[PDB]
Design a protein around this ligand. Structure first.
Ligand SMILES: *[C@@H]1O[C@H](CO[C@@H]2O[C@@H](C)[C@@H](O)[C@@H](O)[C@@H]2O)[C@@H](O[C@@H]2O[C@H](CO)[C@@H](O)[C@H](O)[C@H]2NC(C)=O)[C@H](O)[C@H]1NC(C)=O
Ligand SMILES: *[C@@H]1O[C@H](CO[C@@H]2O[C@@H](C)[C@@H](O)[C@@H](O)[C@@H]2O)[C@@H](O[C@@H]2O[C@H](CO)[C@@H](O)[C@H](O)[C@H]2NC(C)=O)[C@H](O)[C@H]1NC(C)=O
Ligand SMILES: *[C@H]1O[C@H](CO)[C@@H](O)[C@H](O)[C@H]1NC(C)=O
Ligand SMILES: *[C@H]1O[C@H](CO)[C@@H](O)[C@H](O)[C@H]1NC(C)=O
Lengths: 531, 61, 531, 61
């Protein structure tokens, strides 16, 4: 219990050791890294947490940042495992550190985790993000932080000082800066920080990659089922304030200063009450408040940056899951649900193309319908279901990722690609959704090693196999064994090689949904532009 | 009747509505995020769809 | 030699018996069926051949209708086997009859052949169309006729009486009428006439199917590598006279009557000299003068008819060859030739999409490029070559045929589909072109049985196998054995079943280039319309 | 020189052009149908492309 006491620039901390089927780990949960964004501070970039006297209790996780609670399926697991599992509060900027036991003698590489949740939800205290096993097995340091979401994290009035926007990304960054001056106290090496995140967390990672000021805060990146260039990852200044003003209106407000001042006077829950209203209707996989292209945090759209940027001296690990789209369809796509097998009819399918592909012309839709239709089985409910699943998945995740990957690899970086295609045996989601969005996380963190859970012996080995890849990447910038084991090749714009990640061994494959993504990234743009 | 109850920021729990009906407030167009359930049958709007029920018991799910 | 004398409504004829590895056959070649379309008659519908005194010599083929001679590759076989092999003349409306020996005792089914040649070339006297073997093996009656082509057959001044257009189709019909009153003289059964043709000949067949007046002239139809609804099969009244007037201009002419009168004063070769000029530039698989949608012969576009028509009480046999497009590319597609392997570059390919897909918007082309590109091998010369081949082939033959077929089958007819995918061992065309356009003909007529030729023992069996199919269709309206041999199913709009025709046995397959044809027949139309 | 010779309606045959050059008249844009070959180097036009030669012998092919 002598290792559970550590001092950081702010003050003294008292942690707790966590048990593991392999050994204890020292964890420090709830370290305050910013001054709480209460009242006057709401909507403003974060200010560094001021020094404190005495010892801070870092034994239990801290509050989850105020957010909407997804209540689609009351009592369902696949839906509740992502909801806040601690009291909500605007006072939520805290972070956590998981370091080996005993504390490493030499500086050990660090892994910083940014959670997903469409920028409207999420928390570092979710069970599926427990870093004890990953830290215990690969003996690395792990840090995860909470960052503002929803209006509190991203409501923006582009240009204003009261509500500049992207403050959520600023929280993430302040936490990365906290890691630079303090991780060494826990034996972490600030000259070897690797960021990894999933969904919106991956998008965030990508944005820190595209934001100069964040560049001196890490050295490697992992983007899981998400990219900064997705059609949902950002919104323009225009739309940004259109939404911000709508929220104010719905809430009785009221001049930017005036609008915000009023906004600061409303209860957190009142704002969350009207969060979804401001969404330019009919779509799935779209969120109200997200990062804004304002010229500050991002000098240009992520797409613009990803093409003009020089990525030399950078290693990136990117990937998606077998069925990225399935998940979202039950939130609006006609005929879709978790309670049956969603064998939609050609009618529903065609209507679903419009929900799964928001703000697009009628001719654009027909273009989608053409490509995703099996003209030998135009009416087959089974295929139409997997088709609308791919539609949403390719459009929102696979193709954005595939493009970033090729542009990165092609412009000086080392990229490794993967497709997590193994369904967890504990999956509560219906069998038809396959390996849905965000379901590779539980394995990357090695949750199968936890006894209280019921995973298979092979899945525990698998989890271990995966963690090594991640840990290897963190240490060397390369996944495979630093062997005589199947080799994972770098993803090149040329061969476009990636590997499947299931119980079977690494299998190398070319093309990452190449034919489809040509539609999304190359043709569709021209089609829309011409009409 | 035994129905669900919650807000935009609370987890759904069971409650006894009795003879009143129950409701399910959601966003009208996709994403049709559920915004709240409870007792009674309140008005909706362009963005607010409200579905009511009685018989089923725990029907406002 | 008693069977070589036959009398028809016109008069007495003297034929010749032809030798065959299986037995002699009586043939009557060059029977005049129309009054020669000379001078004043040029451009006018044909008039019935007036009765003649004495006996007409029907021992040798008659003149080939005046036409352009394809001289692309001087001395090449794949190109010359289609050129006129008899003196050219405007006096060319003659037909031929091949009847068994001895002459059948009971009325035997008839097969009428209409040759191809893009409506600008062709002749019934080409070696590859010798009906002796087909008649000898399946013991059926075979008739083939010459019909005007080029300006002489189709130059049109829509509405006029001097140059109404489609007179070529009228020649074909007059010959079919000649078959109704005379085929019985050769033992043929006018109540069982089956039309079969290739390329433009198939298109013609289709038009007789869509033209009421021709309906009482046959009972079955076979469309080989062609359909009346192809983008080259017809032209509108507008374009029709735009071209007709251009020809007159280039030729010094000059009021419709005035234009035509002058046109009648020009030498046949002078008109042929300027035939290709009138073609609205840059394209491949497009011909100057073709059938016109004027409301007379065709009351509406073939497409319109094919959808509104009732096809009950009709059996149709349709099909294409493995590589319908290859052939035409050497006539303009950059980087294409018979002298090398046309391994085009991505640059040439993209330019070729425009030649292979005439009069289409830039966005339409990109739409083509998207679908026919292997995005895993965007630059591969081998694949780009087969891609531009499919592009032209699908657009001009496969998809028009696939649609006609489905509309026919779906609207009351019995349809049987096939894909001739066996390369003749005597093919003079380069190996890269595969099984090119019009190369299934030599087998349907059983040319491999001819000793002077060098086909393989298996190919002679094959030829026989094919002729039976054709002959069976003619007799019963069904290809397969009227057995315990693989069965050829009817092509349905549903299953879309067809069989491969190679040395191996009949293999049934679903989908006739379904995915691609969805682009051409369903989407592309909407795309063009919207821009 | 030994070159090809023909019209729009005759099959190509060999001919001795001598010191004159030879030509290949074709349609300028696709379809680039060959319209005629012979001796000399005559003018073309928007629709008529003419290619001349000498050395090769049978080069106007
Ligand atoms: C599969 O489920 C979907 C959605 O769940 C159903 O609808 C709920 C209201 C409730 O009745 C559940 O028990 C069902 O499982 C079904 O789609 C709905 O179908 C109803 C018709 O009864 C229709 O009124 C709704 O609008 C539909 N909802 C939408 C927008 O999809 C679907 O019919 C089910 N399919 C199967 C396999 O039966
Ligand atoms: C394959 O052949 C094509 C066409 O034939 C060639 O060009 C003739 C003029 C003559 O030179 C033949 O012997 C050749 O085989 C080639 O395409 C032509 O290439 C030349 C460059 O030398 C160019 O100037 C022409 O414009 C091209 N013609 C067109 C429009 O396609 C092609 O280069 C050959 N490819 C191979 C395998 O070498
Ligand atoms: C094992 O625990 C899981 C919860 O993680 C539970 O779902 C499963 O039913 C348990 N197995 C049993 C019944 O022992
Ligand atoms: C057989 O005849 C063909 C012509 O049909 C010819 O091409 C081939 O070379 C001949 N075989 C020989 C050389 O005996």
């Amino acid at each position: 219990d002598a290792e559970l006491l550590v001092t950081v620039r702010g003050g003294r901390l008292r942690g707790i050791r966590l048990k593991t089927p392999g050994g204890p780990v020292s964890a420090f949960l709830g370290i305050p890294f910013a001054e709480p964004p209460m009242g006057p501070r709401r909507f403003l970039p974060p200010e560094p947490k001021q020094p404190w006297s005495g010892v801070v209790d870092a034994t239990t996780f801290q509050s989850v940042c105020y957010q909407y609670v997804d209540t689609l399926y009351p009592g369902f697991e696949g839906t509740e495992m992502w909801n806040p599992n601690r009291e909500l509060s605007e006072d939520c900027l805290y972070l956590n550190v998981w370091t080996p036991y005993p504390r490493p003698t030499s500086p050990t590489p660090v892994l910083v985790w940014i959670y997903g949740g469409g920028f409207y939800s999420g928390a570092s205290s979710l069970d599926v993000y427990d870093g004890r096993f990953l830290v215990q097995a690969e003996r690395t340091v792990l840090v995860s932080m909470n960052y503002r979401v929803g209006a509190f994290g991203f409501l923006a009035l582009p240009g204003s000082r009261e509500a500049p926007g992207n403050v959520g990304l600023l929280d993430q960054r302040l936490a990365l800066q906290w890691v630079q001056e303090n991780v060494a106290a826990f034996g972490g090496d600030p000259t070897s920080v690797t960021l990894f995140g999933e969904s919106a967390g991956a998008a965030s990672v990508g944005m820190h990659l595209l934001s100069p000021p964040s560049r001196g805060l890490f050295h490697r990146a992992v983007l899981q089922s998400g990219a900064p260039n997705g059609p949902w990852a950002t919104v323009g200044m225009g739309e940004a304030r259109r939404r911000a003003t709508q929220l104010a209106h719905l809430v009785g407000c009221p001049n930017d200063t005036e609008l915000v001042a009023c906004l600061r006077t409303r209860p957190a829950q009142v704002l969350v009450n009207h969060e979804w209203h401001v969404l330019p209707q009919e779509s799935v996989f779209r969120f109200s408040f997200v990062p804004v292209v304002d010229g500050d945090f991002l000098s240009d759209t992520p797409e613009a940056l990803i093409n003009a940027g020089d990525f030399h001296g950078l290693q990136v690990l990117v990937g998606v899951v077998k069925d990225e789209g399935s998940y979202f369809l039950v939130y609006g796509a006609p005929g879709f649900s978790k309670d049956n097998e969603s064998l939609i009819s050609r009618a529903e399918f065609l209507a679903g193309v419009r929900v799964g592909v928001p703000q697009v012309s009628d001719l654009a839709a027909e273009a989608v319908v053409l490509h995703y239709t099996d003209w030998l089985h135009p009416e087959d409910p089974a295929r139409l279901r997997e088709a609308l699943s791919d539609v949403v998945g390719d459009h929102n995740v696979v193709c954005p990722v595939a493009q970033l990957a090729g542009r990165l690899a092609a412009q000086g970086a080392r990229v490794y690609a993967y497709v997590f295609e193994h369904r967890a045996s504990t999956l509560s989601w219906p069998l038809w959704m396959g390996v849905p969005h965000g379901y590779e996380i539980e394995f990357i963190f090695g949750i199968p090693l936890d006894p209280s859970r019921n995973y298979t012996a092979e899945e525990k080995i698998f989890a271990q196999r995966l963690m090594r890849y991640w840990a290897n990447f963190a240490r060397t910038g390369d996944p495979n064994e630093p062997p005589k084991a199947p080799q994972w090749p770098p993803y090149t714009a040329g061969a476009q090689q990636y590997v499947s990640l299931d119980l079977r061994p690494l299998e190398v494959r070319r093309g990452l949904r190449a034919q489809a993504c040509a539609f999304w990234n190359r043709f569709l743009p021209k089609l829309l532009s011409a009409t | 009747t035994m129905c669900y109850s919650h807000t935009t920021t609370s987890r759904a729990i069971l409650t006894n509505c009795g003879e009143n009906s129950c409701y399910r407030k959601s966003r009208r167009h996709p994403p049709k995020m559920v915004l709240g359930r409870g007792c009674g049958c309140p008005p909706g709007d362009d963005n607010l769809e409200v579905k009511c029920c009685t018989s089923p018991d725990k029907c406002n799910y």
